[PDB]
Each structure stands twice: as structure tokens, then as C-alpha cells.
GROMACS .gro file of N, CA and C in nm:
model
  408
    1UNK      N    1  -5.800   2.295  -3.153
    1UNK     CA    2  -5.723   2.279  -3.034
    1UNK      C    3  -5.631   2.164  -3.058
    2UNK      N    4  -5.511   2.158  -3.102
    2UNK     CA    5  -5.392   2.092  -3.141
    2UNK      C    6  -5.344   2.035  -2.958
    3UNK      N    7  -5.361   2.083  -2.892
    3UNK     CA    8  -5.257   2.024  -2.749
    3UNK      C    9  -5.320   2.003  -2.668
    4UNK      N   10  -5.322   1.951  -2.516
    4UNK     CA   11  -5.381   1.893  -2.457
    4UNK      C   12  -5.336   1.969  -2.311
    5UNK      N   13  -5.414   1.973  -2.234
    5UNK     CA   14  -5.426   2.029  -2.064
    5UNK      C   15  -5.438   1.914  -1.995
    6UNK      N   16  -5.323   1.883  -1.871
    6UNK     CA   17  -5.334   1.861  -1.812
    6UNK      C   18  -5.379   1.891  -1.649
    7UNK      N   19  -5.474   1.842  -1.570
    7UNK     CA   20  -5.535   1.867  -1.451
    7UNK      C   21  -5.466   1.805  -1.357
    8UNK      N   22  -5.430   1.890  -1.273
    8UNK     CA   23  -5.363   1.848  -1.138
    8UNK      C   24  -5.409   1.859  -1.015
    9UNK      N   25  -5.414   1.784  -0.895
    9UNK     CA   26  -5.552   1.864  -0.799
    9UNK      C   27  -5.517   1.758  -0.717
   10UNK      N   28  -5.593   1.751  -0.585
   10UNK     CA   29  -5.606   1.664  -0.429
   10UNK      C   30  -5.697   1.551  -0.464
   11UNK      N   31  -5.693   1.448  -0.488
   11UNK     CA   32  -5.771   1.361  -0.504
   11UNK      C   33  -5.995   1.423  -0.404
   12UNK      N   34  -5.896   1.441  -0.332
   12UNK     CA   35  -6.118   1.505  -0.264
   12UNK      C   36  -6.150   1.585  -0.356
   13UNK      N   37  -6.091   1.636  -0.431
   13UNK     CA   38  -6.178   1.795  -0.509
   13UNK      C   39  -6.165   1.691  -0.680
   14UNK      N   40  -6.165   1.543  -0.656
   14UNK     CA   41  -6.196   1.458  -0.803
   14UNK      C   42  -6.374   1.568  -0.857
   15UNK      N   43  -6.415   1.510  -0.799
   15UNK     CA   44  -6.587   1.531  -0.812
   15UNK      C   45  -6.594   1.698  -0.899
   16UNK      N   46  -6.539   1.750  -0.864
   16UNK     CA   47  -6.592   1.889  -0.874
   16UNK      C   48  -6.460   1.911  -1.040
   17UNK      N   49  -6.331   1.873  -1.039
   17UNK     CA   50  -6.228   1.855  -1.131
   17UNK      C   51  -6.311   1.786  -1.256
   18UNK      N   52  -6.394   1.640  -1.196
   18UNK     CA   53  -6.424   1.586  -1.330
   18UNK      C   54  -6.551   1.698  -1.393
   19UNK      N   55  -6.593   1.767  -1.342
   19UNK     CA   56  -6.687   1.864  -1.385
   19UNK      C   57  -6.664   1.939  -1.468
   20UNK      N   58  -6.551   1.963  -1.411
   20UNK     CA   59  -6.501   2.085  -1.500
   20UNK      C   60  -6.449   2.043  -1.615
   21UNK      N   61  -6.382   1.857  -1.651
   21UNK     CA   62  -6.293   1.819  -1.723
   21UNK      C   63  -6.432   1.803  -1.834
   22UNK      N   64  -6.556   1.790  -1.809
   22UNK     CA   65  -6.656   1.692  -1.866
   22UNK      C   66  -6.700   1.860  -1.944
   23UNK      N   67  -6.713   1.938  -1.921
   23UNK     CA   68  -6.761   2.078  -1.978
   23UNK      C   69  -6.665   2.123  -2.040
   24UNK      N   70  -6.529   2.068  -2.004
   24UNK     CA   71  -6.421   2.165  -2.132
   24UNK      C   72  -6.412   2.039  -2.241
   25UNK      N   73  -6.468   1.916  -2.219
   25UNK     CA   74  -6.449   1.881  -2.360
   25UNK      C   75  -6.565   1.850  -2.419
   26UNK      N   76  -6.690   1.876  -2.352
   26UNK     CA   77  -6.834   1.912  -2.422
   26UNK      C   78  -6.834   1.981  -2.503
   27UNK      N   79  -6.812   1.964  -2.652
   27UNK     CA   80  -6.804   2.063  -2.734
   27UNK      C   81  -6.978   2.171  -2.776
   28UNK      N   82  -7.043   2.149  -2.694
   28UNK     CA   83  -7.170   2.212  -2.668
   28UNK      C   84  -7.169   2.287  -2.554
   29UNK      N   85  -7.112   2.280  -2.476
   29UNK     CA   86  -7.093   2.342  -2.373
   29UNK      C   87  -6.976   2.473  -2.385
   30UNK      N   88  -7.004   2.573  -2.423
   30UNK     CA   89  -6.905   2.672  -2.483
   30UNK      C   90  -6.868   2.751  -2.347
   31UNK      N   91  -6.848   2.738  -2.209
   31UNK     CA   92  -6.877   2.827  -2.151
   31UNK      C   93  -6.670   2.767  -2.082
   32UNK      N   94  -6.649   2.630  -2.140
   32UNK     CA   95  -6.542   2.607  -2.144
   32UNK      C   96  -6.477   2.489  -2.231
   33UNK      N   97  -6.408   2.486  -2.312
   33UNK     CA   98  -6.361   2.445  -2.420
   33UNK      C   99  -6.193   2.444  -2.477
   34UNK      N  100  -6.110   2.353  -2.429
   34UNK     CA  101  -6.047   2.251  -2.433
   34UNK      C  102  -6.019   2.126  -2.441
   35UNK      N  103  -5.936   2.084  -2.470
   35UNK     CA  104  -5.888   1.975  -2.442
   35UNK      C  105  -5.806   1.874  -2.310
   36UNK      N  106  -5.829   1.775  -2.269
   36UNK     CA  107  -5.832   1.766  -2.131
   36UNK      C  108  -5.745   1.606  -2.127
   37UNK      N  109  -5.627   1.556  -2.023
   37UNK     CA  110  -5.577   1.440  -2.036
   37UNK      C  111  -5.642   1.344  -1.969
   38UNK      N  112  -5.715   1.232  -1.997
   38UNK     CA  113  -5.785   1.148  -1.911
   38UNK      C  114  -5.705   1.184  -1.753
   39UNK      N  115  -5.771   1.195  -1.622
   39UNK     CA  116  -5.732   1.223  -1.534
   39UNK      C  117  -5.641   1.107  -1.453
   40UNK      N  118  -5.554   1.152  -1.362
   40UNK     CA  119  -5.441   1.010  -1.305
   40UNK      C  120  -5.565   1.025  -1.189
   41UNK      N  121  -5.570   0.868  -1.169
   41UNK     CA  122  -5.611   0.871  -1.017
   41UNK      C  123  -5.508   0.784  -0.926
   42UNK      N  124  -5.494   0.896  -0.836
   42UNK     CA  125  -5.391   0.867  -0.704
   42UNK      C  126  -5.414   0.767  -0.595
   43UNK      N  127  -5.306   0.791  -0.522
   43UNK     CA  128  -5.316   0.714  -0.423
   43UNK      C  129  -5.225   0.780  -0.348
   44UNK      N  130  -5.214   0.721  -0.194
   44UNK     CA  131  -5.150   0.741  -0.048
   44UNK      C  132  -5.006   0.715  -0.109
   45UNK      N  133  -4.917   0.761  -0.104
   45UNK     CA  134  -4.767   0.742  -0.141
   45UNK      C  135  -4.686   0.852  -0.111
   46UNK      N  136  -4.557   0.873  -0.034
   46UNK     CA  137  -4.445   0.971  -0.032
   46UNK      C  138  -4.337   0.938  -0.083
   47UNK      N  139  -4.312   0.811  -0.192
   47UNK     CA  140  -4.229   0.749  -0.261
   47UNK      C  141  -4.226   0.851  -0.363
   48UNK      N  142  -4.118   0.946  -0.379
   48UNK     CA  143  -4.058   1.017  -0.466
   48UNK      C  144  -4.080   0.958  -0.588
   49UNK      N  145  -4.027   0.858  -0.685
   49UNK     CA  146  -3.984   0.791  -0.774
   49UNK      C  147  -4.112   0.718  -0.788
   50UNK      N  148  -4.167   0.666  -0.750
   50UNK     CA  149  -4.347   0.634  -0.728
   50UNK      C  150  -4.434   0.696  -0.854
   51UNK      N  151  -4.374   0.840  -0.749
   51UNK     CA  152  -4.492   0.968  -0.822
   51UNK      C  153  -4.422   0.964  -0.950
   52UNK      N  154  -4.315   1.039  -0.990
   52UNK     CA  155  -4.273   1.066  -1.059
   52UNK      C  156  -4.277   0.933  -1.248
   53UNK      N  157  -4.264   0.846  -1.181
   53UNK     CA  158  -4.319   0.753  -1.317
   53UNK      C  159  -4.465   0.757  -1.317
   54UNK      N  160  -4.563   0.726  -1.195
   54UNK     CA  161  -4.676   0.709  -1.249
   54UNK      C  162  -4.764   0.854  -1.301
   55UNK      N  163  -4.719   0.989  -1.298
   55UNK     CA  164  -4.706   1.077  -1.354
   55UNK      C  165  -4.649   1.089  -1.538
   56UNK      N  166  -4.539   1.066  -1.537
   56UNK     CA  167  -4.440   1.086  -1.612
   56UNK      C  168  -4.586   1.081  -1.789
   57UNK      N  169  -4.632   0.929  -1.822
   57UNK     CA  170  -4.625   0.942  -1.986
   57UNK      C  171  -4.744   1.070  -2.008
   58UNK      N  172  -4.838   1.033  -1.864
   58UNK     CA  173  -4.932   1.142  -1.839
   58UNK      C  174  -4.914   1.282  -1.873
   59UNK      N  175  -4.858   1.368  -1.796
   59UNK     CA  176  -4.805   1.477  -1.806
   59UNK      C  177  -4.742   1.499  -1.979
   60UNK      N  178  -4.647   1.380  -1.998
   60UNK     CA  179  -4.577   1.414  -2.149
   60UNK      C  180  -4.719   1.417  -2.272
   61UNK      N  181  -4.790   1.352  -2.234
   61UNK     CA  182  -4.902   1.374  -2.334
   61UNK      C  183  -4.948   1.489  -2.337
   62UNK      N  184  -4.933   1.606  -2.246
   62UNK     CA  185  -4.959   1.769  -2.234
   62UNK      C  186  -4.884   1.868  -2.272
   63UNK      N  187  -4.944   1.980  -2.330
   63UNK     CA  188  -4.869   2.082  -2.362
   63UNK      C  189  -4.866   2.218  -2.214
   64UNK      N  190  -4.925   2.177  -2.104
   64UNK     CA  191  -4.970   2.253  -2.014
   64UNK      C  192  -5.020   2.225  -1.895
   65UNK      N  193  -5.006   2.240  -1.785
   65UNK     CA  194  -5.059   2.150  -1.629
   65UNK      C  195  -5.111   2.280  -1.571
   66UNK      N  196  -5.246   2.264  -1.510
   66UNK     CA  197  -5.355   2.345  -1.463
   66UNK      C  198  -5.326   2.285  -1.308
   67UNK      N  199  -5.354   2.363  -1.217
   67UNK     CA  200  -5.294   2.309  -1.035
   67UNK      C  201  -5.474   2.357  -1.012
   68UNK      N  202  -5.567   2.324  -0.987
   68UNK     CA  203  -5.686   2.346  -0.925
   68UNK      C  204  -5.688   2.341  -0.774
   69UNK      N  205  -5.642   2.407  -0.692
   69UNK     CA  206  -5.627   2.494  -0.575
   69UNK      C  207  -5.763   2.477  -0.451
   70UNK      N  208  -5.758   2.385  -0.427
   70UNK     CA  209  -5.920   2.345  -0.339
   70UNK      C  210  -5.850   2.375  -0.190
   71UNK      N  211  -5.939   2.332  -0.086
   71UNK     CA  212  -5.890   2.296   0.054
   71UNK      C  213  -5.800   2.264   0.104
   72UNK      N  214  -5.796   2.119   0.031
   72UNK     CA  215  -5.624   2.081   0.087
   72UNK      C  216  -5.522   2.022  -0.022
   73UNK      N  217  -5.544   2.136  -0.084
   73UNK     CA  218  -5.427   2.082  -0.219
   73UNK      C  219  -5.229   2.082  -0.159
   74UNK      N  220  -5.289   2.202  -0.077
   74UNK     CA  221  -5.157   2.243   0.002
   74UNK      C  222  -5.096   2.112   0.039
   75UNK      N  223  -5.168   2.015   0.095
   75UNK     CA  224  -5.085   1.900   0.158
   75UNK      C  225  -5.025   1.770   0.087
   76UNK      N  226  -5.097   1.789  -0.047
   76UNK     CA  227  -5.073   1.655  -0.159
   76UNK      C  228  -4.901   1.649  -0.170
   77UNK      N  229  -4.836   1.519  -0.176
   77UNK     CA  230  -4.761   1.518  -0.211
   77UNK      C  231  -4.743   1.491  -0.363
   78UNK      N  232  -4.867   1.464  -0.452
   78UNK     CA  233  -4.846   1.450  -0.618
   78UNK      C  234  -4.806   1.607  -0.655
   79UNK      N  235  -4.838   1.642  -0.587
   79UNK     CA  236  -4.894   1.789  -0.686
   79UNK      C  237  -4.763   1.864  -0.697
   80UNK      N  238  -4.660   1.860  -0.589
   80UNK     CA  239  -4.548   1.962  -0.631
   80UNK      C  240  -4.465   1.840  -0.710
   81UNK      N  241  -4.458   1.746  -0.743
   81UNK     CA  242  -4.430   1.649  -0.846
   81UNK      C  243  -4.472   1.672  -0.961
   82UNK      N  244  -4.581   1.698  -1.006
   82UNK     CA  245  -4.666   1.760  -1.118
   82UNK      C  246  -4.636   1.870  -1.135
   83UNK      N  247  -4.595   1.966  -1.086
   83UNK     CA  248  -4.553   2.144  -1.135
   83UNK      C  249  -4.415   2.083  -1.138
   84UNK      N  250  -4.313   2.016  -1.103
   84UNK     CA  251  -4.202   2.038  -1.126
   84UNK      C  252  -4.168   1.974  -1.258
   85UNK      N  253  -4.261   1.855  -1.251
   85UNK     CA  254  -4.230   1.777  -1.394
   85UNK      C  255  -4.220   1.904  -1.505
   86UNK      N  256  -4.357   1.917  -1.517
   86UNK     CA  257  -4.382   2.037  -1.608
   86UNK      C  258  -4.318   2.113  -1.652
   87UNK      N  259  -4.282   2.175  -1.527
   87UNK     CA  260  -4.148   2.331  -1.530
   87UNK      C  261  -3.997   2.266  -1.612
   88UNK      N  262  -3.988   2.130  -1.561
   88UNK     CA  263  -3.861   2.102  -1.601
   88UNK      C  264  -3.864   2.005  -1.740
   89UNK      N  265  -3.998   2.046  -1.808
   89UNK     CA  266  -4.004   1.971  -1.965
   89UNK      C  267  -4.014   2.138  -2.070
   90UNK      N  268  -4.024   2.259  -1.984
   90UNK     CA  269  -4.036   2.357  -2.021
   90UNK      C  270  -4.133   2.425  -2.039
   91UNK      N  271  -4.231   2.364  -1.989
   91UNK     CA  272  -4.386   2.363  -2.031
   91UNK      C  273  -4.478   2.466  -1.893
   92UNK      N  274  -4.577   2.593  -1.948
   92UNK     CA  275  -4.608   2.591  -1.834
   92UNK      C  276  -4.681   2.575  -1.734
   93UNK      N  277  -4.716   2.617  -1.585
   93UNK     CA  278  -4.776   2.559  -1.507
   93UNK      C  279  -4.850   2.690  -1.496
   94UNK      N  280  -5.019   2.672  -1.474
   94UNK     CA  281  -5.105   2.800  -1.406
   94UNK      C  282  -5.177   2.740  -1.311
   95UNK      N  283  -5.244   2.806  -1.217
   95UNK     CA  284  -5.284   2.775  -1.117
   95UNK      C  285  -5.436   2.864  -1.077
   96UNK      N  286  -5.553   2.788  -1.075
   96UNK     CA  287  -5.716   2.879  -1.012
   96UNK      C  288  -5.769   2.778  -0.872
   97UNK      N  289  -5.832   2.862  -0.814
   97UNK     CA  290  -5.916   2.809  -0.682
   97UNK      C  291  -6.027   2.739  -0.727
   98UNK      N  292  -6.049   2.656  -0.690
   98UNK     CA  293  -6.200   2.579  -0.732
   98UNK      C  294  -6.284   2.673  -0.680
   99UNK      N  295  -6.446   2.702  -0.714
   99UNK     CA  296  -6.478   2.753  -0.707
   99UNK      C  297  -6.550   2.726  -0.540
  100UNK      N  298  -6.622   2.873  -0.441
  100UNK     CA  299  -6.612   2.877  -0.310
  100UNK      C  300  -6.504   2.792  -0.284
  101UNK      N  301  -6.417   2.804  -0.292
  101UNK     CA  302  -6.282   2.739  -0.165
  101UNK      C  303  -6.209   2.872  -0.133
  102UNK      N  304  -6.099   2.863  -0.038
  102UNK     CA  305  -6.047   2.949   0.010
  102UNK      C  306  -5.909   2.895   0.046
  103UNK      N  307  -5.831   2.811  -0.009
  103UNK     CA  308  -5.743   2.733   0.075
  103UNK      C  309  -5.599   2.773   0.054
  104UNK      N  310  -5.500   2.713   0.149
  104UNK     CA  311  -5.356   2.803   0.170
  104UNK      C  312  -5.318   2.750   0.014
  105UNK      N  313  -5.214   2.816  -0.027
  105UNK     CA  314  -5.159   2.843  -0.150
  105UNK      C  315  -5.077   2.745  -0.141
  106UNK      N  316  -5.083   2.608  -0.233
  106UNK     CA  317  -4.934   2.519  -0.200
  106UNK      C  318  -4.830   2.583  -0.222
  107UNK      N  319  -4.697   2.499  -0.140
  107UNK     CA  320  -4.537   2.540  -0.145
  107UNK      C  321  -4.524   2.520  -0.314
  108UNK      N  322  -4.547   2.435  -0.353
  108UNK     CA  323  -4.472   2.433  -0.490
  108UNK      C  324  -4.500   2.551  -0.579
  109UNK      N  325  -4.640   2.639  -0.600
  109UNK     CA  326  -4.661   2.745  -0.652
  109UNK      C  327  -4.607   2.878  -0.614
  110UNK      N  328  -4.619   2.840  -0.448
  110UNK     CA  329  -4.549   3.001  -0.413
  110UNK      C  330  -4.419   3.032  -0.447
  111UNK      N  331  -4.333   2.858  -0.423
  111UNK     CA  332  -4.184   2.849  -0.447
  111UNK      C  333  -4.149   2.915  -0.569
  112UNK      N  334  -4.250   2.863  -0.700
  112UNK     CA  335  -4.203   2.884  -0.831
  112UNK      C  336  -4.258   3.033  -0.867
  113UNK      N  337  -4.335   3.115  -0.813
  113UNK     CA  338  -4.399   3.223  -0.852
  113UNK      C  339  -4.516   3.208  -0.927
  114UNK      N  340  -4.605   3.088  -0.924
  114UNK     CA  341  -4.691   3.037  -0.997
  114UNK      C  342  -4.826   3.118  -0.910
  115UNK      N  343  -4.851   3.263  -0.989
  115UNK     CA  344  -5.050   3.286  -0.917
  115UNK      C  345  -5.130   3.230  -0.929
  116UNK      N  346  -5.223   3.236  -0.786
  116UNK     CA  347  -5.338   3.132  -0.805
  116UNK      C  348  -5.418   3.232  -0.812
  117UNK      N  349  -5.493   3.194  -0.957
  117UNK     CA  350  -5.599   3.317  -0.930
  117UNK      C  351  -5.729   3.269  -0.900
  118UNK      N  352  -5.794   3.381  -0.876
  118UNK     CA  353  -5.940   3.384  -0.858
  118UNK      C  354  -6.046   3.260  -0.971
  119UNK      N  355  -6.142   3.178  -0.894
  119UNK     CA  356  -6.215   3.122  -0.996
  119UNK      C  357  -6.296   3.177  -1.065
  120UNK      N  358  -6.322   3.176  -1.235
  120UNK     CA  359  -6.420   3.203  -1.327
  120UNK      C  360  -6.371   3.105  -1.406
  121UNK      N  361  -6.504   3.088  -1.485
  121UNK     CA  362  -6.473   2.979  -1.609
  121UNK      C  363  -6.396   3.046  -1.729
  122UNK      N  364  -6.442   3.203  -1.763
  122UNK     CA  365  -6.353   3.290  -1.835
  122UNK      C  366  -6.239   3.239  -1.812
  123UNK      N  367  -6.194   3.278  -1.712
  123UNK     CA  368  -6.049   3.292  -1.631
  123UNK      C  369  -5.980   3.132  -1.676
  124UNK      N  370  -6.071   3.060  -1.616
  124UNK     CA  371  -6.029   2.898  -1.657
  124UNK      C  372  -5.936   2.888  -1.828
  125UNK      N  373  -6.042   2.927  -1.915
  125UNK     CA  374  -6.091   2.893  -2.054
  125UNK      C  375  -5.929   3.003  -2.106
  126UNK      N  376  -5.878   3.146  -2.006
  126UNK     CA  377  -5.772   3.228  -2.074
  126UNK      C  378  -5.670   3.077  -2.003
  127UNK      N  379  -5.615   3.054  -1.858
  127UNK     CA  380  -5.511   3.016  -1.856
  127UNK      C  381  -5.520   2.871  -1.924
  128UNK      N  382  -5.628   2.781  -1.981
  128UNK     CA  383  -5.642   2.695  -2.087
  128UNK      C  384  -5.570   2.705  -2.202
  129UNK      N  385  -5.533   2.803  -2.240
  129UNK     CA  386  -5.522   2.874  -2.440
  129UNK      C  387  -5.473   2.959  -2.419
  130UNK      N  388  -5.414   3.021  -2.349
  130UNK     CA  389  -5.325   3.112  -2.390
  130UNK      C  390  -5.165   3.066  -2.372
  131UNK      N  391  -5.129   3.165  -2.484
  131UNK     CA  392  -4.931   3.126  -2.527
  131UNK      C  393  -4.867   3.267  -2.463
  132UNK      N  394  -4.763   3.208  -2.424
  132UNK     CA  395  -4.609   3.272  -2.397
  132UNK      C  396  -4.558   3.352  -2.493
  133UNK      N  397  -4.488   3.466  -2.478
  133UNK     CA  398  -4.389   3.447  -2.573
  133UNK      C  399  -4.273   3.367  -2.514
  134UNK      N  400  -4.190   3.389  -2.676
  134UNK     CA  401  -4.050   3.286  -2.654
  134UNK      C  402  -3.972   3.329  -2.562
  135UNK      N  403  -3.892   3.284  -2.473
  135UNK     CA  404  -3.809   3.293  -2.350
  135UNK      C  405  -3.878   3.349  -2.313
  136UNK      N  406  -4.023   3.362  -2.264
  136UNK     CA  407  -4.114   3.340  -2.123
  136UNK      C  408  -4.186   3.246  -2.123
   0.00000   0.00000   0.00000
């Protein structure tokens, strides 16, 4: 695994994110297996320019940004900061529900056409590792 995943998510759904971050780089734990960017921890801010640097070397250390889709991801203001960075380094963005949640689909995914799919760790482990082709 040459590149690195970045995790994007609502600061409340940390707990259940670092779970998932701690099993994809358990290399004993095969049930998910990646590579993972030490996680940003946030804070209260609607300072545009804020987000966007304390994001920024983060994200560039990734070949890929994962949106983990909980309760109230819908309302974060990091998070459509984080898919846009992404989109606009060329890189792309996928999006799964934490597992039992049910929550509205953020603006920044629906905007971009980004599906949120259904949770499995399968599911996790394909939008982890899998490639594009060129000009998609």
C-alpha cells in the first residue's frame, strides 16, 4: 500500500472513526487494511481560511478522502472544506454511513455527485483501494 487515506467525519462519530482507523492499519486485522492519515482534530470555527490551512498539509499527505456519514455530519462546517480540497487537488472523494446511522446526506456530497453508500467493511476496504481510470 504505497498511498495514504484520508478520514473525514463530525468530530462526535471520533470514537467509532478511530476504530475503524485502528483496524485498517492493524496489519492482523484483515477484515480492513489500509493505510490511514493520523486524524485532524477539530474544533468550533466558520472561519473559511481557518479550515482550509489547518486542513491543507493533512489532506496533501493523501492520495484519497473517505467522508464517514454519521448523524450529524450534514452540519460540519470542516467537511465540505475537506471534499472540496480534495476534488480540487484532483484526487478522489468516496463517501459510507457509519455503521447503524441513518443520517441526511451532506450538501457537499450531494452537490458533487459523491454516493454515500451503505456500511460494510468489504465496502469500506473497495472504496479504500480502488483506482479510476484516467479522466475519471
Amino acid at each position: 500500500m504505497s498511498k495514504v487515506v484520508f478520514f473525514s467525519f463530525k468530530e462526535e462519530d471520533r470514537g467509532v472513526v478511530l476504530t475503524i482507523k485502528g483496524r485498517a492499519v492493524n496489519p492482523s486485522y484483515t477484515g480492513l487494511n489500509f493505510r490511514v492519515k493520523d486524524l485532524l482534530k477539530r474544533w468550533k470555527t466558520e472561519d473559511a481560511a481557518v479550515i482550509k490551512q489547518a486542513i491543507s498539509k493533512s489532506i496533501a499527505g493523501t492520495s484519497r478522502t473517505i467522508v464517514f456519514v454519521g448523524e450529524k455530519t450534514h452540519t460540519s462546517y470542516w467537511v465540505p472544506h475537506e471534499v472540496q480540497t480534495t476534488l480540487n487537488a484532483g484526487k478522489p472523494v468516496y463517501a459510507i454511513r457509519l455503521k447503524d446511522t441513518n443520517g441526511k446526506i451532506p450538501q457537499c456530497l450531494s452537490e458533487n455527485g459523491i454516493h454515500v453508500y451503505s456500511w460494510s467493511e468489504e465496502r469500506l476496504q473497495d472504496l479504500a483501494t480502488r483506482l479510476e481510470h484516467h479522466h475519471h
